[PDB]
């Protein structure tokens, strides 16, 4: 479409921006879709990612800004948000202000009001609405990326409620949904009152195959070919041509073992001693050293136990071809762009068989446009499951997208904020709200009976009052703005209004709530019961029987003991080994606990309980109180802070007055950076 044919709808300046990015002509599906893209009607675009639907959304947002509007772009994950924000920055060159929402817990991010394109997640967009962010009402166009996640038990409900809140607030809102292909995507279009464009076109053709007992059968449509080959050669022939290989495994253990195996192959072709160093800079425990050795050899594994920095290092080096093979778990976020000529799937389990949808998502990553004439996706399978792999996955179709909203926890969680935000003042109005959801579109089931039960539960919890009408209480408003589960708020409020808590008491209180991630109690964790009894008088409760409540309690206690070791400055590798977790797990647990500690303190303040104040910053840094002054300094975390403090250097003044000693204690380069920062701040 020559791109210049777009100059009438987006500016000629915008065409210029596209040319500077290299885009001279559009893909066939894009050219077919642009007319609907530049209309004012709601629109659903269902295409593979490689077919360029994000660019179509971008041009829609650019045109919306020229028309005097303002666009909110929502993604399901923070990482996806960073990627899209950085990619959208190019539009600043023609004067568009691009913003991304903050990490703050209960903020309005009012600064974003003057942006023309705002990137956020769906949870954060809902939070911004709950906190009365004033610029939401100025949004004229909402783009919902990955709207097929309506199918997800974890993420679908939030998408339904967010879209409904925005459409009821602004009748003139234009909604654009971006989806993977699925058999019923037009039902999503119908829910949005939208036009649609659906296409399976991809820029690189994909062939899909099964490897069984040393024979590969490969399919282009209904036509197949056969080859005598093994897994190792399938990887190596690709590595030798810098083609990029992505291997999916079911478990972390499998991914690590396969990455170590393949590193022997990749070592013949590359060495990255700098990348090995980068892998080890935050952590150098057992997993990290194994990963660093893989990376120096040109391989990597990729799972939730890596630190975020390690994941970023692996992803960038893979995009650069320094890392030849990445062995990942199926948790690998869809938005992580990992261009590979060849995808190899050895992960039959996920959690629970792998969905056809998930297999197809792994398969569609194969084929690097402009490099590969063909992408290959290969399932490795035993002779027993070979027919299943051929017939249900290779020749399968992705499942129908079906609402997961109709579950009591989602109904309770969202009904609280619907009532708090004023979207519904009566039971009939609450039912009317839910009649606008995708759930209702698919099922036409009125939830009156279930919603009544949920409202009664919220009323027994002190979150709402059913007077003449339905209203939030003070606690309900607070809980809604904190974005915690109503049950979490009830537990916090009930305990903190009755008693003061020690450290372990408040950590355990956090670990009682449904929002906290808890550790699994293993057969070797009898010390957890010992510690639970020894500390029981510090806890907000202790079970009476040895019922299943007791096992749940032991899980809460083990998680609280982990957080306790964290804030008592235990070495993080020792924490990982003691609790059977990886460094990335400890970071994720700590971040979740920090968020919930903040919410617990807000509730504590409202009831006049001072006994958990100070916990949140300790959880944030993993330090005893004495170190807080030091860790607020940039480049000073728990380790450097403890080293300085133990040498008598206990605040920024001491650092500045003892530069030489500081340099001997934590390194001269580090000390120069730290002194520079402190002198800057004064």
From Swiss-Prot:
Domain of life: Archaea
Alphabetized InterPro entries for the sequence: DEAD/DEAH_box_helicase_dom, Hel308-like_dom4, Hel308_SKI2-like, Helicase_ATP-bd, Helicase_C-like, Helicase_Hel308, HTH_61, P-loop_NTPase
Motif (DEAH box) on chain: 145-148
Class in the EC hierarchy, top level: isomerase
Residue ranges annotated for the Helicase C-terminal domain, each copy included: 230-417
UniProt KW keywords: ATP-binding, DNA damage, DNA repair, DNA-binding, Helicase, Hydrolase, Isomerase, Nucleotide-binding
Annotated ATP binding sites: 30, 47-54
GO biological process, alphabetically ordered: DNA repair
Record field: catalytic activity: Couples ATP hydrolysis with the unwinding of duplex DNA by translocating in the 3'-5' direction; ATP + H2O = ADP + phosphate + H(+)
Region of interest (Required for helicase but not ATPase activity), residue spans: 396-682
Pfam hit, one: Helicase_C
Residue stretches making up the Helicase ATP-binding domain: 34-200
EC number assigned by the record: 5.6.2.4
SMART domains: DEXDc, HELICc
GO molecular function: 3'-5' DNA helicase activity; ATP binding; ATP hydrolysis activity; DNA binding
Subunit structure: Monomer.
Free-text note on domains in this protein's UniProt record: The N-terminal region (1-400) has DNA-dependent ATPase activity but no helicase activity.
Role summary: DNA-dependent ATPase and 3'-5' DNA helicase that may be involved in repair of stalled replication forks.
Family: Belongs to the helicase family. Hel308 subfamily.
The protein's name: ATP-dependent DNA helicase Hel308
Species the sequence originates in: Archaeoglobus fulgidus (strain ATCC 49558 / DSM 4304 / JCM 9628 / NBRC 100126 / VC-16)
